[PDB]
Structure 1
Amino acid sequence: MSPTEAPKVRVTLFCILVGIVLAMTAVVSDHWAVLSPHCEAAHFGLWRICTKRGEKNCSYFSISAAAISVFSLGFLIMGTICALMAFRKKRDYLLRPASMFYVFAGLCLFVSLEVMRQSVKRMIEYYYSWSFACACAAFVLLFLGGISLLLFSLPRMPQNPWESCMDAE
């Protein structure tokens, strides 16, 4: 009850509940780039590429980011299964891996972010408004709500000569 029902571990776990959906806001919305030739204004994403002058023509062609963000979504889903099952049956050891997959799901958007930047750099201007700063707020959420959940579930630095990690109870 001490590492799983403390409020400092549930403020963090509710914070991941924000970043679980903001990284889902990014992975469906294709709004994190603006092609601006000057009409051929196109808005890039992972899955659909839509050129807007209504003449809303959304289609596909980017593959790297898409493939990389199967792992960012999937890892998060797997992480939840460790985290949803670690609040019951008095097991708290289980949470330790749940904090691993949220760092990974954090860092598998950050490849995605870097992968999407190259596409806009190789292809007329660039501007991101709606879903780069979404995912750069779900990167920084999942990457840092994962490391803090880790240190809020690893026991403590021992602080005394007698104490040891994995110390009884």
Structure 2
Amino acid sequence: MSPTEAPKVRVTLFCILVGIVLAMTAVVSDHWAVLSEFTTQKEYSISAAAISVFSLGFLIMGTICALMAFRKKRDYLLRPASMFYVFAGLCLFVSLEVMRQSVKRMIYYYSWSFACACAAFVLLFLGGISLLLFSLPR
């Protein structure tokens, strides 16, 4: 690989874990929305999303241990798949977000910070994963 592949990813990974925690909080939050089936389905999508995310994280640490003790294309392969799974999980989070938004329309009540935080999380995951995926080619 390249040292920059470490140094640049060193930057992106912070946003990755950041949006990861942001997502964990996004699910965990009881303040999903102020309260003056498709919800469950979107929640399931969130489940597959987070599962894909953790799998991607395993792919990432695996990529680190690999690059530490293997050539590169193997470890890079672990990374690209990680950016991939994290990406699809991210888009899935976007899906659950939009779905929950539309379900909110189906419903007084008000938008909560956890939702937008989830949105920015999925955004950061989107650009970040897009970058790490972009990092693979070069």
Scaled by the length of structure 2, the TM-score of the pair is 0.52
Is the 1:107–1:143 contact (alpha carbons within 8 Å) kept by the matching residues of 2?
A: yes
- The verdict on how the C-alpha distance between 1:89 and 1:71 changes in structure 2, with shifts beyond 3 A counting, is closer
Number of aligned positions between the proteins? 135
Q: In the alignment, which residue of structure 2 is the partner of 1:17?
A: 17
Report the alpha carbon displacement of residue 17 of structure 1 after superposing the two structures with TM. Answer: 1.1
Report the alpha carbon displacement of residue 22 of structure 1 after superposing the two structures with TM. Answer: 0.3
Scaled by the length of structure 1, the TM-score of the pair is 0.45
Is the 1:33–1:128 contact (alpha carbons within 8 Å) kept by the matching residues of 2?
A: yes
Max radius of gyration: which structure? 1
Question: Which protein has the bigger helix share?
Answer: 2
What are the Cα deviations for residues 136-159 of structure 1, in whole angstroms up to 9, with x where unaligned? 345434542444333442232xxx
Report the alpha carbon displacement of residue 20 of structure 1 after superposing the two structures with TM. Answer: 1.0
Higher relative contact order (CA 8 A, sep 6+): 2
Report the alpha carbon displacement of residue 4 of structure 1 after superposing the two structures with TM. Answer: 6.5
- The verdict on how the C-alpha distance between 1:152 and 1:139 changes in structure 2, with shifts beyond 3 A counting, is same
Report the alpha carbon displacement of residue 68 of structure 1 after superposing the two structures with TM. Answer: 9.6
Could you say what the CA RMSD is over the residues aligned between the two structures, in angstroms?
A: 5.9
- SS of the residue aligned with 2:41? strand
**Percent of matched pairs sharing the same residue:** 96
- The verdict on how the C-alpha distance between 1:131 and 1:72 changes in structure 2, with shifts beyond 3 A counting, is farther
- SS of the residue aligned with 1:27? helix
Report the alpha carbon displacement of residue 19 of structure 1 after superposing the two structures with TM. Answer: 0.8
Distance in structure 2 (CA, Å) of the matches to 1:2 and 1:19: 26
